Amino acid sequence: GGALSYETEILTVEYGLLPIGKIVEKRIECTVYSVDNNGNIYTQPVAQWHDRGEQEVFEYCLEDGSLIRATKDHKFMTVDGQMLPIDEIFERELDLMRVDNLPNIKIATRKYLGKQNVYDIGVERDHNFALKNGFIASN
């Protein structure tokens, strides 16, 4: 289910906003944020840690100026809840759901950057988690 760059911060109950790459490089145990089948933001522990090592990373920039760094194989929870890869979100010009009831906005600009270290935590209940910008990623 793709991966996210070191600079991608994950909201956690144990500490707060911390870089996903440090959680996987140091195997840090913590709790994360996610919606249930009803749309209720609950909290759950990390199940496992996975490290891709180096994959094709693309810049993901928004209409507001928010800046995100991920692979074209990582899915993200759309405004309706669909788990589609960012390569397909750009083509349909679909928006992504937010935690803070922020205005949903599609990818303003995209380009290939190169081959950066990317990481992705694993989870038992639901393979998803919130982000610093109120976003939700899913594996």
Write down all domains in the chain, each with its CATH number in brackets.
Answer: 1-139 (2.170.16.10)
First to last CA, the chain: 4
Beta strands in 6-130 (DSSP E): 9-10, 18-19, 31-35, 41-45, 48-51, 55-62, 67-71, 75-77, 83-85, 107-116, 118-122, 128-130
Distance (Å, whole) CA 89 – CA 74: 11
Q: Label residue 48 left, alpha or beta by phi (over 0 means left) and psi (-120 to 50 means alpha).
A: beta
Cα-based distances in Å from 52 to 18, 38, 66, 73, 139: 19, 32, 24, 12, 13
Q: Is 121 exposed, middle or buried (0-12, 13-18, 19+ CB in 10 A)?
A: buried
Structural tokens at position 40: 């209720």
- On whether 64 is known to bind a ligand per the annotation, the reply is no
User: With contact defined as beta carbons under 8 Å apart, do 82 and 99 qualify?
Assistant: no
User: With contact defined as beta carbons under 8 Å apart, do 119 and 51 qualify?
Assistant: yes
User: Which structural technique was applied?
Assistant: NMR
